Amino acid sequence: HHHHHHSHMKSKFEASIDNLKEIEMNAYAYELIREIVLPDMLGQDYSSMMYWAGKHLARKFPLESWEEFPAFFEEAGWGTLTNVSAKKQELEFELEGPIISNRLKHQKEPCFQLEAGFIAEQIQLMNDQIAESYEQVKKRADKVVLTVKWDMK
């Protein structure tokens, strides 16, 4: 895996959204965009495109350490991310919440490639000695499990 992972600057707009964390909206409005409008426009390519959008997003919103993942996920409305395993070359998280529960109940196969790509890219941005990573998104009854593991280069 020969690639130098590095972050890049946010635009003025991208930086400005931090100031909107205190403005209240609702999860219906959120799903309307993320889980209706987007899949409607992207169709069969939605999964691969979200994966790479997750990596692209990581580059704009780089974090400094693994411990920061849960807070980012929660604030981003991606759900509650709990660590089940944290080993030298493997991370496993549970991800859940009312929006996710509704997806698991009513969608054939919910997609979490945005989240998977984001974590994979963050891990690489933080450590230039990481070669390639592999991600798994496993559906359970009331939650999903995100697993990212990797080799050293």
Added chain:
Amino acid sequence: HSHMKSKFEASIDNLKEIEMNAYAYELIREIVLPDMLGQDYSSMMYWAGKHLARKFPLESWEEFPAFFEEAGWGTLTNVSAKKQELEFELEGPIISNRLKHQKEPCFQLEAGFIAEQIQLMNDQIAESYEQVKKRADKVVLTVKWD
């Protein structure tokens, strides 16, 4: 396109009372989404608005403001009703932040939604036109039919 929701699409109604902050919303709608729809973001979003309208039908245009508010699209006001036309203004804190920092804010989803709702109402060809007015901190959406 289609006027029937999937079971999941119908289910998001019971998320209307679940909280979500505006940062999370803008992260998906104004950062992730445009990066997946580059140059021709506008045609896609216009179509998507129509596609949405067909499965979220509204009986009258007087219902547009409530729909916009709940959908987090902003505060929509009808400001005129000239011959074969309706003019709306769209504004609010999230929109203001877009107008302040974005080179070319885009409201084609909203425009397509209004166009198709009207077309389904009167069975005549309708289209919507957008004008961002930074100096008045608002967007004007005008829908015309023939």
